[PDB]
Amino acid sequence: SEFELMKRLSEIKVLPILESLKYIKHNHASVVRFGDGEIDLMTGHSIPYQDYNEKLAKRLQQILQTKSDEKLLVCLPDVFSNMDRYNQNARHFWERHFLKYSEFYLNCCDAPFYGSTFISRPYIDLIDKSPSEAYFESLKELWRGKDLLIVEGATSRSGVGNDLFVAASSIKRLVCPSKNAFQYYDEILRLTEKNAKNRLILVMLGPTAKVLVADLTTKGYQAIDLGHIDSEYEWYEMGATYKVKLTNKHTAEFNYDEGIELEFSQEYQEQIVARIG
Ligand SMILES: O=c1ccn([C@@H]2O[C@H](COP(=O)(O)OP(=O)(O)O)[C@@H](O)[C@H]2O)c(=O)[nH]1
């Protein structure tokens, strides 16, 4: 019954984090990741930071149907095999998720392989956190010495107050809405293009990020969907063992963005090229 579905879905093949990073670097590929929220949206549901939207839903479906080629790595949650890597609560969440969406997952994902959606989630739900340093060190090699364009939300503040991007040669940021960024999609795409000349683009923008990465990739740019990497890095730096709320910025899975004390970070402010919303 349900278990038969769990087993059928284990036919989906995901390159785990460290392995995914190698594909990206070899092809200098854009990366687009599909997580639980994207499945929610595609099957018709609103999620905490993005209301359901038909065109977004169609685009996401189209993007997931794109085979991982040389220009793009398409990622799925790395939960279809070796679930034992994750804590019990994560395992329960993910199995319930892919069974709720058995109709979707049984018909959506026939590509020979996928990257790991957890390249942005390399710490908090793991039982053995040892490879995390290797994970974060390997991630950092994507931007060491690069000029970056970071497209993210107002509360995202990726790298703010930590050393995640210390080795980037420069950072420019396009700061978009923290929720429902798709309401402003046309502008976000327009300014990302204008600001992306000779830069590696990193996108932390929920479901909108996926369409952005795809459209950018169509227009020739390399764009990497990095989602909640900052939350996971903050948790890691703290040596955290559970999802603790951050006080100064957005925190993964505290997605209402309530109770935040924003700070003035002059370095962050000097990186901002434009605000949208
Ligand atoms: O309309 C939105 C949707 C989300 N985000 C940001 O998108 C990031 C999370 O992206 P995603 O859902 O892809 O993360 P994942 O959990 O898959 O890593 C966070 O910084 C959110 O603040 C945003 O700024 N605007």
Side-chain angles (χ1 to χ4, degrees):
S1 267
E2 289 185 342
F3 178 85
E4 136 179 10
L5 304 182
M6 163 181 129
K7 270 231 155 73
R8 262 159 78 197
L9 293 180
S10 64
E11 192 185 342
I12 299 166
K13 290 163 281 281
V14 168
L15 308 170
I17 301 169
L18 282 181
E19 301 307 316
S20 276
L21 288 165
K22 299 171 177 143
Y23 182 102
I24 298 162
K25 294 169 185 176
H26 222 241
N27 293 282
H28 315 321
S30 294
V31 178
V32 58
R33 307 173 303 98
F34 288 79
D36 58 298
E38 284 62 54
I39 306 295
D40 287 332
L41 210 302
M42 281 183 291
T43 60
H45 295 83
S46 294
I47 69 175
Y49 45 48
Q50 178 59 62
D51 291 350
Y52 176 80
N53 180 284
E54 300 172 315
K55 189 179 171 313
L56 172 60
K58 181 193 323 199
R59 288 299 289 118
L60 292 176
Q61 293 181 256
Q62 293 173 345
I63 296 160
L64 182 57
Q65 293 306 317
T66 303
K67 296 314 188 305
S68 289
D69 50 41
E70 304 80 7
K71 315 269 93 66
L72 187 70
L73 181 64
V74 175
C75 308
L76 282 178
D78 191 4
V79 299
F80 297 109
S81 301
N82 308 318
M83 188 72 103
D84 24 80
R85 285 175 289 171
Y86 311 107
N87 60 55
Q88 277 167 208
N89 257 231
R91 306 201 293 255
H92 178 242
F93 172 90
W94 285 110
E95 188 173 302
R96 292 284 90 212
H97 168 82
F98 63 65
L99 295 171
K100 172 185 199 294
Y101 293 118
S102 62
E103 288 167 80
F104 185 89
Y105 278 109
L106 283 181
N107 303 293
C108 71
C109 302
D110 295 320
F113 69 101
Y114 294 90
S116 176
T117 290
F118 301 159
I119 67 161
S120 60
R121 315 296 309 239
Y123 180 77
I124 206 56
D125 281 339
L126 290 180
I127 273 158
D128 191 6
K129 288 165 158 59
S130 309
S132 289
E133 172 163 3
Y135 293 164
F136 281 116
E137 294 302 298
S138 178
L139 275 162
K140 289 170 174 175
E141 285 302 330
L142 293 163
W143 53 81
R144 176 167 246 165
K146 304 298 189 199
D147 292 312
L148 299 176
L149 178 59
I150 288 177
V151 186
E152 65 178 0
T155 62
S156 295
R157 297 159 125 73
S158 303
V160 180
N162 63 62
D163 62 8
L164 184 57
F165 303 118
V166 70
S169 299
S170 74
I171 300 170
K172 298 301 179 191
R173 300 182 190 251
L174 243 213
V175 181
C176 304
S178 54
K179 293 176 169 188
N180 287 317
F182 199 75
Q183 292 158 348
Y184 301 85
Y185 184 77
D186 291 323
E187 178 176 8
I188 297 173
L189 174 56
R190 185 184 41 198
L191 301 190
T192 297
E193 254 210 284
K194 286 180 169 90
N195 280 282
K197 300 320 177 307
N198 271 19
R199 292 177 185 273
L200 176 64
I201 306 173
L202 308 179
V203 192
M204 298 75 149
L205 210 70
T208 304
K210 333 298 179 196
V211 52
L212 185 53
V213 171
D215 283 357
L216 277 164
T217 303
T218 315
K219 301 169 183 286
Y221 298 100
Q222 187 192 4
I224 307 179
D225 170 15
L226 287 185
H228 278 125
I229 188 175
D230 180 86
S231 293
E232 294 265 1
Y233 192 64
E234 291 265 356
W235 287 330
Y236 161 82
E237 293 281 89
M238 262 169 146
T241 64
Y242 71 109
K243 295 180 182 180
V244 42
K245 174 123 181 4
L246 307 169
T247 64
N248 63 325
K249 53 171 82 169
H250 174 77
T251 306
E253 287 80 66
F254 293 85
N255 296 335
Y256 292 150
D257 282 337
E258 290 160 349
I260 302 169
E261 168 202 340
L262 294 179
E263 295 161 331
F264 195 82
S265 306
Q266 180 171 326
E267 189 181 337
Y268 169 70
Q269 299 291 325
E270 287 167 343
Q271 295 170 353
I272 297 175
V273 294
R275 293 190 177 264
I276 291 165

